[PDB]
Each structure stands twice: as structure tokens, then as C-alpha cells.
Short mmCIF file of all heavy atoms in Angstrom, two decimals:
data_model
loop_
_atom_site.label_atom_id
_atom_site.label_comp_id
_atom_site.label_asym_id
_atom_site.label_seq_id
_atom_site.Cartn_x
_atom_site.Cartn_y
_atom_site.Cartn_z
N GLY C 1173 9.52 -11.60 16.87
CA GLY C 1173 9.64 -13.07 16.97
C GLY C 1173 8.49 -13.82 16.29
O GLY C 1173 8.20 -14.97 16.65
N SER C 1174 7.78 -13.18 15.38
CA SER C 1174 6.64 -13.84 14.72
C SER C 1174 6.52 -13.38 13.27
O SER C 1174 7.18 -12.41 12.84
CB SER C 1174 5.34 -13.60 15.42
OG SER C 1174 4.87 -12.27 15.15
N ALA C 1175 5.67 -14.09 12.56
CA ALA C 1175 5.22 -13.76 11.21
C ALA C 1175 3.69 -13.65 11.25
O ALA C 1175 3.04 -14.39 12.04
CB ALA C 1175 5.69 -14.80 10.22
N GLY C 1176 3.16 -12.75 10.44
CA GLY C 1176 1.72 -12.65 10.20
C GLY C 1176 1.43 -12.61 8.72
O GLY C 1176 2.37 -12.57 7.89
N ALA C 1177 0.15 -12.59 8.38
CA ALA C 1177 -0.27 -12.59 6.98
C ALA C 1177 -1.55 -11.78 6.82
O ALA C 1177 -2.46 -11.87 7.69
CB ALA C 1177 -0.44 -14.01 6.53
N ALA C 1178 -1.62 -11.05 5.72
CA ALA C 1178 -2.79 -10.24 5.35
C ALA C 1178 -3.14 -10.53 3.89
O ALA C 1178 -2.23 -10.62 3.04
CB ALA C 1178 -2.49 -8.79 5.57
N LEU C 1179 -4.42 -10.69 3.65
CA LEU C 1179 -5.00 -10.82 2.29
C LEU C 1179 -5.69 -9.51 1.96
O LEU C 1179 -6.54 -9.04 2.77
CB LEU C 1179 -6.08 -11.90 2.25
CG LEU C 1179 -5.63 -13.34 2.08
CD1 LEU C 1179 -6.81 -14.27 2.28
CD2 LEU C 1179 -5.01 -13.57 0.70
N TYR C 1180 -5.43 -8.97 0.80
CA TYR C 1180 -6.18 -7.80 0.31
C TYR C 1180 -6.52 -8.01 -1.15
O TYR C 1180 -5.64 -8.40 -1.93
CB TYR C 1180 -5.39 -6.51 0.53
CG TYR C 1180 -6.12 -5.25 0.09
CD1 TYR C 1180 -7.32 -4.87 0.68
CD2 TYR C 1180 -5.57 -4.40 -0.86
CE1 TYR C 1180 -7.97 -3.70 0.32
CE2 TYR C 1180 -6.21 -3.23 -1.23
CZ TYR C 1180 -7.40 -2.86 -0.62
OH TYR C 1180 -8.07 -1.71 -0.96
N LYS C 1181 -7.75 -7.68 -1.49
CA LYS C 1181 -8.21 -7.60 -2.90
C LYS C 1181 -8.14 -6.14 -3.35
O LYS C 1181 -8.88 -5.28 -2.81
CB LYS C 1181 -9.63 -8.12 -3.04
CG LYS C 1181 -10.09 -8.20 -4.49
CD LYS C 1181 -11.53 -8.70 -4.54
CE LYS C 1181 -12.14 -8.61 -5.91
NZ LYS C 1181 -13.44 -9.33 -6.02
N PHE C 1182 -7.22 -5.81 -4.22
CA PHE C 1182 -7.06 -4.45 -4.79
C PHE C 1182 -8.32 -4.02 -5.54
O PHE C 1182 -8.93 -4.79 -6.29
CB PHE C 1182 -5.82 -4.37 -5.67
CG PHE C 1182 -4.55 -4.28 -4.87
CD1 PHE C 1182 -3.77 -5.40 -4.68
CD2 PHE C 1182 -4.18 -3.09 -4.27
CE1 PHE C 1182 -2.64 -5.33 -3.90
CE2 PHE C 1182 -3.05 -3.02 -3.48
CZ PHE C 1182 -2.26 -4.14 -3.33
N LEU C 1183 -8.75 -2.79 -5.23
CA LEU C 1183 -9.99 -2.19 -5.76
C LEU C 1183 -9.68 -0.96 -6.63
O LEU C 1183 -10.58 -0.50 -7.31
CB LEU C 1183 -10.89 -1.80 -4.60
CG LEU C 1183 -11.33 -2.95 -3.70
CD1 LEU C 1183 -12.19 -2.43 -2.56
CD2 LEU C 1183 -12.06 -4.01 -4.48
N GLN C 1184 -8.50 -0.38 -6.51
CA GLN C 1184 -8.11 0.84 -7.22
C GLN C 1184 -6.72 0.62 -7.77
O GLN C 1184 -5.88 -0.02 -7.13
CB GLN C 1184 -8.11 2.05 -6.27
CG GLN C 1184 -9.47 2.39 -5.68
CD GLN C 1184 -10.25 3.24 -6.64
OE1 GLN C 1184 -10.19 3.03 -7.84
NE2 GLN C 1184 -10.93 4.24 -6.12
N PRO C 1185 -6.43 1.17 -8.96
CA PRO C 1185 -5.09 1.17 -9.50
C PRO C 1185 -4.27 2.27 -8.82
O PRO C 1185 -4.80 3.10 -8.15
CB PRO C 1185 -5.33 1.49 -10.99
CG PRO C 1185 -6.51 2.43 -10.95
CD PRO C 1185 -7.38 1.89 -9.83
N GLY C 1186 -2.99 2.25 -9.10
CA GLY C 1186 -2.03 3.29 -8.75
C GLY C 1186 -0.96 2.76 -7.84
O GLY C 1186 -0.82 1.52 -7.66
N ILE C 1187 -0.27 3.71 -7.22
CA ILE C 1187 0.82 3.41 -6.26
C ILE C 1187 0.23 3.28 -4.85
O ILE C 1187 -0.62 4.15 -4.46
CB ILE C 1187 1.93 4.48 -6.25
CG1 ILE C 1187 2.78 4.43 -7.52
CG2 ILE C 1187 2.77 4.35 -4.97
CD1 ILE C 1187 3.53 5.72 -7.79
N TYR C 1188 0.66 2.24 -4.15
CA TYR C 1188 0.33 2.00 -2.73
C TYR C 1188 1.68 1.93 -2.03
O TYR C 1188 2.61 1.42 -2.63
CB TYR C 1188 -0.40 0.70 -2.47
CG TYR C 1188 -1.80 0.66 -3.01
CD1 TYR C 1188 -2.02 0.61 -4.38
CD2 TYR C 1188 -2.90 0.61 -2.19
CE1 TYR C 1188 -3.29 0.52 -4.90
CE2 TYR C 1188 -4.19 0.56 -2.70
CZ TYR C 1188 -4.38 0.52 -4.07
OH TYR C 1188 -5.61 0.49 -4.62
N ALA C 1189 1.80 2.57 -0.88
CA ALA C 1189 2.98 2.38 -0.01
C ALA C 1189 2.57 1.34 1.03
O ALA C 1189 1.48 1.45 1.63
CB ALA C 1189 3.36 3.70 0.59
N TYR C 1190 3.40 0.35 1.23
CA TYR C 1190 3.29 -0.60 2.35
C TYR C 1190 4.35 -0.23 3.38
O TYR C 1190 5.53 -0.22 3.02
CB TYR C 1190 3.48 -2.01 1.80
CG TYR C 1190 3.34 -3.11 2.81
CD1 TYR C 1190 2.11 -3.59 3.20
CD2 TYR C 1190 4.46 -3.64 3.42
CE1 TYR C 1190 2.01 -4.61 4.12
CE2 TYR C 1190 4.37 -4.65 4.36
CZ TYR C 1190 3.14 -5.16 4.69
OH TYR C 1190 3.08 -6.18 5.57
N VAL C 1191 3.94 0.08 4.62
CA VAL C 1191 4.83 0.66 5.64
C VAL C 1191 4.67 -0.08 6.95
O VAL C 1191 3.63 -0.71 7.16
CB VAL C 1191 4.59 2.18 5.82
CG1 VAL C 1191 4.88 2.92 4.53
CG2 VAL C 1191 3.19 2.49 6.35
N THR C 1192 5.64 0.07 7.82
CA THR C 1192 5.35 0.00 9.27
C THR C 1192 4.85 1.39 9.69
O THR C 1192 5.42 2.40 9.25
CB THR C 1192 6.56 -0.47 10.07
OG1 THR C 1192 6.09 -0.56 11.42
CG2 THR C 1192 7.73 0.49 9.96
N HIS C 1193 3.72 1.47 10.39
CA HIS C 1193 3.07 2.77 10.69
C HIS C 1193 3.62 3.43 11.97
O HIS C 1193 2.91 4.30 12.54
CB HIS C 1193 1.54 2.67 10.67
CG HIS C 1193 0.89 3.92 10.18
ND1 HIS C 1193 0.89 5.12 10.89
CD2 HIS C 1193 0.24 4.19 9.02
CE1 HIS C 1193 0.22 6.02 10.20
NE2 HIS C 1193 -0.17 5.48 9.06
N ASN C 1194 4.88 3.17 12.33
CA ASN C 1194 5.73 4.22 12.94
C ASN C 1194 6.32 4.95 11.73
O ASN C 1194 7.24 4.41 11.06
CB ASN C 1194 6.79 3.70 13.90
CG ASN C 1194 7.53 4.88 14.49
OD1 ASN C 1194 7.86 5.82 13.76
ND2 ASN C 1194 7.72 4.91 15.81
N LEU C 1195 5.75 6.10 11.40
CA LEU C 1195 6.10 6.81 10.14
C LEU C 1195 7.52 7.35 10.18
O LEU C 1195 8.03 7.61 9.10
CB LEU C 1195 5.11 7.94 9.90
CG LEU C 1195 3.66 7.47 9.77
CD1 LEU C 1195 2.75 8.66 9.77
CD2 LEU C 1195 3.47 6.62 8.51
N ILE C 1196 8.11 7.55 11.38
CA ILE C 1196 9.54 7.89 11.46
C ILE C 1196 10.35 6.72 10.89
O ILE C 1196 11.23 6.93 10.03
CB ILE C 1196 9.98 8.24 12.90
CG1 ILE C 1196 9.10 9.35 13.50
CG2 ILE C 1196 11.45 8.60 12.87
CD1 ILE C 1196 9.30 9.54 14.99
N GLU C 1197 10.03 5.51 11.33
CA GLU C 1197 10.73 4.31 10.81
C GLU C 1197 10.47 4.18 9.30
O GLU C 1197 11.42 3.91 8.54
CB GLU C 1197 10.27 3.08 11.56
CG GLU C 1197 10.67 3.08 13.00
CD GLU C 1197 10.23 1.83 13.77
OE1 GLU C 1197 10.17 0.71 13.16
OE2 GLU C 1197 9.90 1.97 14.98
N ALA C 1198 9.23 4.36 8.87
CA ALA C 1198 8.87 4.17 7.45
C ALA C 1198 9.60 5.14 6.54
O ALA C 1198 10.04 4.72 5.44
CB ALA C 1198 7.38 4.33 7.26
N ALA C 1199 9.58 6.42 6.86
CA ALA C 1199 10.10 7.47 5.96
C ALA C 1199 11.57 7.75 6.20
O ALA C 1199 12.24 8.16 5.21
CB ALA C 1199 9.30 8.73 6.11
N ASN C 1200 12.05 7.66 7.44
CA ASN C 1200 13.42 8.13 7.77
C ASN C 1200 14.39 6.98 8.07
O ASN C 1200 15.62 7.25 8.01
CB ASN C 1200 13.33 9.11 8.93
CG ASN C 1200 12.57 10.37 8.55
OD1 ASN C 1200 12.30 10.64 7.37
ND2 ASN C 1200 12.19 11.14 9.54
N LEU C 1201 13.94 5.76 8.38
CA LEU C 1201 14.87 4.63 8.71
C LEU C 1201 14.76 3.50 7.69
O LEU C 1201 15.49 2.52 7.83
CB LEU C 1201 14.62 4.09 10.12
CG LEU C 1201 15.25 4.88 11.25
CD1 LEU C 1201 14.43 6.15 11.55
CD2 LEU C 1201 15.37 4.00 12.47
N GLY C 1202 13.92 3.65 6.66
CA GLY C 1202 13.95 2.77 5.47
C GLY C 1202 12.76 1.84 5.27
O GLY C 1202 12.86 1.03 4.34
N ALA C 1203 11.70 1.86 6.08
CA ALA C 1203 10.70 0.76 6.11
C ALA C 1203 9.46 1.13 5.27
O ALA C 1203 8.33 1.24 5.81
CB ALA C 1203 10.31 0.43 7.52
N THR C 1204 9.67 1.33 3.96
CA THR C 1204 8.61 1.60 2.98
C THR C 1204 8.83 0.69 1.76
O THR C 1204 9.98 0.70 1.20
CB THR C 1204 8.59 3.07 2.54
OG1 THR C 1204 8.28 3.94 3.63
CG2 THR C 1204 7.58 3.32 1.42
N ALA C 1205 7.79 0.00 1.34
CA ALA C 1205 7.70 -0.73 0.06
C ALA C 1205 6.59 -0.12 -0.79
O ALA C 1205 5.72 0.60 -0.23
CB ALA C 1205 7.41 -2.18 0.28
N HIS C 1206 6.68 -0.31 -2.11
CA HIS C 1206 5.64 0.17 -3.04
C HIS C 1206 4.98 -1.00 -3.77
O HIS C 1206 5.66 -1.96 -4.08
CB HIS C 1206 6.16 1.11 -4.10
CG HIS C 1206 6.48 2.44 -3.59
ND1 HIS C 1206 7.25 3.31 -4.33
CD2 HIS C 1206 6.16 3.05 -2.42
CE1 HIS C 1206 7.44 4.40 -3.60
NE2 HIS C 1206 6.79 4.26 -2.42
N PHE C 1207 3.67 -0.92 -3.90
CA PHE C 1207 2.89 -1.69 -4.90
C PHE C 1207 2.51 -0.76 -6.04
O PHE C 1207 2.12 0.39 -5.78
CB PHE C 1207 1.60 -2.28 -4.35
CG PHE C 1207 1.76 -3.45 -3.44
CD1 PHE C 1207 2.06 -3.24 -2.11
CD2 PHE C 1207 1.58 -4.73 -3.91
CE1 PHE C 1207 2.20 -4.31 -1.25
CE2 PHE C 1207 1.74 -5.80 -3.04
CZ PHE C 1207 2.04 -5.59 -1.72
N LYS C 1208 2.69 -1.25 -7.26
CA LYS C 1208 2.18 -0.60 -8.49
C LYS C 1208 1.05 -1.49 -9.02
O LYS C 1208 1.31 -2.65 -9.38
CB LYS C 1208 3.30 -0.41 -9.50
CG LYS C 1208 4.28 0.70 -9.13
CD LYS C 1208 5.43 0.89 -10.10
CE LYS C 1208 6.37 1.99 -9.66
NZ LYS C 1208 7.62 1.94 -10.45
N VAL C 1209 -0.14 -0.95 -9.04
CA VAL C 1209 -1.36 -1.73 -9.33
C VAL C 1209 -1.98 -1.17 -10.62
O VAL C 1209 -2.21 0.01 -10.70
CB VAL C 1209 -2.36 -1.68 -8.16
CG1 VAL C 1209 -3.56 -2.51 -8.49
CG2 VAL C 1209 -1.70 -2.16 -6.87
N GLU C 1210 -2.11 -2.03 -11.61
CA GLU C 1210 -2.65 -1.71 -12.95
C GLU C 1210 -4.17 -1.96 -12.90
O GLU C 1210 -4.64 -2.92 -12.27
CB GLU C 1210 -1.94 -2.56 -14.00
CG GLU C 1210 -0.49 -2.09 -14.26
CD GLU C 1210 0.18 -2.57 -15.57
OE1 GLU C 1210 -0.14 -3.69 -16.02
OE2 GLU C 1210 1.05 -1.83 -16.15
N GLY C 1211 -4.91 -1.11 -13.57
CA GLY C 1211 -6.36 -1.26 -13.76
C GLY C 1211 -7.06 0.08 -13.95
O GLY C 1211 -6.36 1.09 -14.20
N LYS C 1212 -8.37 0.09 -13.78
CA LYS C 1212 -9.23 1.27 -14.03
C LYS C 1212 -9.71 1.88 -12.70
O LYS C 1212 -10.12 1.14 -11.81
CB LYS C 1212 -10.41 0.89 -14.92
CG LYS C 1212 -10.10 0.92 -16.41
CD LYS C 1212 -11.25 0.43 -17.26
CE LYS C 1212 -10.95 0.61 -18.73
NZ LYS C 1212 -11.76 -0.33 -19.53
N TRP C 1213 -9.65 3.19 -12.61
CA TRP C 1213 -10.01 3.95 -11.40
C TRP C 1213 -11.52 3.87 -11.18
O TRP C 1213 -12.29 3.98 -12.15
CB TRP C 1213 -9.54 5.40 -11.55
CG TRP C 1213 -9.90 6.22 -10.36
CD1 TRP C 1213 -10.98 7.03 -10.19
CD2 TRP C 1213 -9.18 6.24 -9.12
NE1 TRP C 1213 -10.93 7.62 -8.95
CE2 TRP C 1213 -9.85 7.14 -8.27
CE3 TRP C 1213 -8.02 5.60 -8.67
CZ2 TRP C 1213 -9.42 7.39 -6.97
CZ3 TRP C 1213 -7.59 5.88 -7.40
CH2 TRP C 1213 -8.31 6.72 -6.55
N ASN C 1214 -11.94 3.66 -9.94
CA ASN C 1214 -13.35 3.58 -9.53
C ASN C 1214 -13.71 4.91 -8.85
O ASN C 1214 -13.37 5.10 -7.67
CB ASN C 1214 -13.54 2.35 -8.66
CG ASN C 1214 -14.97 2.21 -8.20
OD1 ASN C 1214 -15.76 3.12 -8.33
ND2 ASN C 1214 -15.29 1.05 -7.66
N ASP C 1215 -14.35 5.82 -9.57
CA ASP C 1215 -14.73 7.14 -9.04
C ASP C 1215 -15.84 7.03 -7.99
O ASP C 1215 -16.07 8.03 -7.24
CB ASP C 1215 -15.18 8.06 -10.17
CG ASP C 1215 -14.00 8.71 -10.86
OD1 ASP C 1215 -13.16 9.38 -10.14
OD2 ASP C 1215 -13.89 8.50 -12.07
N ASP C 1216 -16.56 5.92 -7.94
CA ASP C 1216 -17.56 5.72 -6.86
C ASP C 1216 -16.88 5.58 -5.48
O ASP C 1216 -17.43 6.12 -4.50
CB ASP C 1216 -18.44 4.50 -7.11
CG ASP C 1216 -19.58 4.38 -6.12
OD1 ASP C 1216 -20.33 5.37 -5.93
OD2 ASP C 1216 -19.66 3.32 -5.48
#
């Protein structure tokens, strides 16, 4: 019954999964989104 909001500043390129962290729901009932983030890898 609510909405929330999160701000993140991306620090690394690559694929990120955005999930609900009931991983049964995320992987087996459909609740996974992907971010594809372009840039240079930070080995530090």
C-alpha cells in the first residue's frame, strides 16, 4: 500500500539485478529487473 524511493550513484559498469530479496519471488515468480551500466571498471 505504499511507494518508496532510492537514489544510487553507479560506481561500476556491468549488469546489476534489481530484485525483491525474497529470492524465491525474484528468481522463480518473476521479480527481477536488470540495469546495464556503461563505463570503466574500478579495480580499487
Side-chain angles (χ1 to χ4, degrees):
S1174 76
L1179 277 171
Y1180 182 61
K1181 186 181 171 169
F1182 283 101
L1183 300 178
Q1184 297 276 38
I1187 288 159
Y1188 292 69
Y1190 182 81
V1191 298
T1192 184
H1193 214 291
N1194 183 317
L1195 300 171
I1196 306 169
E1197 293 181 33
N1200 295 347
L1201 279 77
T1204 296
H1206 287 165
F1207 286 82
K1208 287 178 181 167
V1209 182
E1210 287 198 328
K1212 275 176 175 157
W1213 179 263
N1214 180 348
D1215 277 305
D1216 187 52

